[PDB]
Scaffold this active site. Structure first.
Site, PDB file in Angstrom:
ATOM      1  N   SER A 117      24.962 -52.510  67.513  1.00  0.00           N
ATOM      2  CA  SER A 117      24.689 -53.504  68.550  1.00  0.00           C
ATOM      3  C   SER A 117      23.316 -54.111  68.387  1.00  0.00           C
ATOM      4  O   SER A 117      22.339 -53.382  68.193  1.00  0.00           O
ATOM      5  CB  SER A 117      24.710 -52.831  69.920  1.00  0.00           C
ATOM      6  OG  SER A 117      25.957 -52.239  70.190  1.00  0.00           O
ATOM      7  N   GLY A 118      23.221 -55.433  68.472  1.00  0.00           N
ATOM      8  CA  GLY A 118      21.924 -56.087  68.442  1.00  0.00           C
ATOM      9  C   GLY A 118      21.469 -56.552  67.069  1.00  0.00           C
ATOM     10  O   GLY A 118      20.535 -57.351  66.946  1.00  0.00           O
TER      11      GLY A 118
ATOM     12  N   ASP B  67      25.473 -61.802  75.784  1.00  0.00           N
ATOM     13  CA  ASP B  67      24.979 -60.494  75.371  1.00  0.00           C
ATOM     14  C   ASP B  67      23.796 -60.655  74.422  1.00  0.00           C
ATOM     15  O   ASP B  67      23.902 -60.424  73.217  1.00  0.00           O
ATOM     16  CB  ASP B  67      26.118 -59.697  74.721  1.00  0.00           C
ATOM     17  CG  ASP B  67      25.790 -58.233  74.545  1.00  0.00           C
ATOM     18  OD1 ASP B  67      24.728 -57.773  75.033  1.00  0.00           O
ATOM     19  OD2 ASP B  67      26.624 -57.527  73.927  1.00  0.00           O
TER      20      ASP B  67
ATOM     21  N   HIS C 177      23.214 -55.517  76.131  1.00  0.00           N
ATOM     22  CA  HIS C 177      23.712 -54.205  76.530  1.00  0.00           C
ATOM     23  C   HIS C 177      22.853 -53.057  76.008  1.00  0.00           C
ATOM     24  O   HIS C 177      23.077 -51.903  76.375  1.00  0.00           O
ATOM     25  CB  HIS C 177      25.207 -54.017  76.217  1.00  0.00           C
ATOM     26  CG  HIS C 177      25.526 -53.831  74.765  1.00  0.00           C
ATOM     27  ND1 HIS C 177      26.005 -54.850  73.970  1.00  0.00           N
ATOM     28  CD2 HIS C 177      25.512 -52.721  73.987  1.00  0.00           C
ATOM     29  CE1 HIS C 177      26.236 -54.389  72.753  1.00  0.00           C
ATOM     30  NE2 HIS C 177      25.946 -53.099  72.736  1.00  0.00           N
TER      31      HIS C 177
ATOM     32  N   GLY D 186      26.115 -48.361  67.785  1.00  0.00           N
ATOM     33  CA  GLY D 186      24.804 -48.190  67.192  1.00  0.00           C
ATOM     34  C   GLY D 186      24.336 -49.391  66.385  1.00  0.00           C
ATOM     35  O   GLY D 186      23.141 -49.506  66.070  1.00  0.00           O
TER      36      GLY D 186
HETATM   37  O1  LIG Z   1      31.445 -55.012  65.857  1.00  0.00           O
HETATM   38  C1  LIG Z   1      31.462 -54.125  66.693  1.00  0.00           C
HETATM   39  C2  LIG Z   1      30.275 -53.622  67.473  1.00  0.00           C
HETATM   40  C3  LIG Z   1      30.836 -52.536  68.360  1.00  0.00           C
HETATM   41  C4  LIG Z   1      30.250 -51.708  69.289  1.00  0.00           C
HETATM   42  C5  LIG Z   1      31.026 -50.782  69.965  1.00  0.00           C
HETATM   43  C6  LIG Z   1      32.378 -50.708  69.701  1.00  0.00           C
HETATM   44 BR1  LIG Z   1      33.410 -49.438  70.654  1.00  0.00          BR
HETATM   45  C7  LIG Z   1      32.978 -51.530  68.763  1.00  0.00           C
HETATM   46  C8  LIG Z   1      32.195 -52.462  68.073  1.00  0.00           C
HETATM   47  N1  LIG Z   1      32.531 -53.398  67.089  1.00  0.00           N
END
Ligand SMILES: O=C1Cc2ccc(Br)cc2N1
Ligand SMILES: *[C@@H]1O[C@H](CO)[C@@H](O)[C@H](O)[C@H]1NC(C)=O
Ligand SMILES: [Zn+2]
Length: 219
Positions: free
Chosen positions: A175-176, A88, A44, A173
């Site tokens: 993510s990844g 993902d 994503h 933020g």
């Molecule tokens: O662990 C995670 C990563 C993440 C990204 C976005 C959102 Br909204 C919630 C969460 N929880």
């Protein structure tokens, strides 16, 4: 990272800070260096183009440890599904091989109750901005029923991560970024609730190892 602590600068030398360009302003993700020219991250986080910064701690303060590297090609998992959120995962090929330094290196590449760690520059609260510094948090690996409320969660494909009785979590933020258990990457930050109430859902790296190896060999 919510409820974590600031990392000792450069203590996670595989960490990658991603700036992603698209019809909108830049977005940001984490990722991790697994070969000198490959970064692993979430699907994503794909965009029109991406820049990777290695060697960072305070991402607002340029320093000699920084290596800002062009990404030549994105390899988003071909089955990544925007409805179910399955698969993902994404590999980024860097234009050139990164330099190995004290601050930049590759990451050498578990029952519930086990504790794992995740790092990132993401939001430090639901309504807080992204962190200037790399943060990390220790999270509990949960039994899959803990994530049943995520209706498209799949135990074969994903890890369920974070004790619901603690506020600790990765967030926007982050993510990844890798989830490490005993120093080895087991998961990738993927998604969770918009209110950050744990647990959250991480990509189970082991399932995707053959796909990763295949990309690492064709490119
Ligand atoms: O662990 C995670 C990563 C993440 C990204 C976005 C959102 Br909204 C919630 C969460 N929880
Ligand atoms: C990061 O660097 C910026 C610019 O030098 C500074 O303003 C900020 O306070 C720093 N953050 C931390 C926590 O060191
Ligand atoms: Zn430094």
């Amino acid at each position: 990272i919510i409820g974590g602590t600031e990392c000792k600068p450069h203590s996670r030398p595989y960490m990658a800070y991603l700036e992603i360009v698209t019809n909108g302003p830049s977005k940001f993700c984490g990722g991790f260096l697994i070969r000198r020219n490959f970064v692993l991250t979430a699907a994503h986080c794909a965009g029109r183009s991406i820049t990777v910064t290695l060697g960072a701690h305070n991402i607002t303060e340029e320093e000699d440890t920084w290596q800002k590297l062009e990404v030549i090609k994105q390899f988003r998992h071909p089955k990544y599904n925007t409805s179910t959120l399955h698969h993902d995962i994404m590999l980024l090929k860097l234009k050139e091989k990164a330099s190995l330094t004290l601050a930049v290196g590759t990451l050498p590449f578990v029952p519930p109750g086990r504790m794992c760690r995740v790092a990132g520059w993401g939001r430090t609260g639901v309504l807080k901005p992204g962190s200037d510094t790399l943060q990390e948090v220790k999270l509990r690996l949960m039994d899959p029923q803990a994530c049943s409320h995520f209706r498209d969660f799949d135990h074969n494909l994903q890890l369920c991560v974070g004790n619901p009785r603690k506020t600790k979590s990765a967030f926007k933020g982050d993510s990844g970024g890798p989830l490490l258990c005993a120093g080895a990457a087991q998961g990738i930050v993927s998604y969770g609730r918009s209110d950050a109430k744990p647990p959250a859902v991480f990509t189970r790296i082991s399932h995707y190892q053959p796909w990763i190896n295949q990309i690492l060999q064709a490119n």
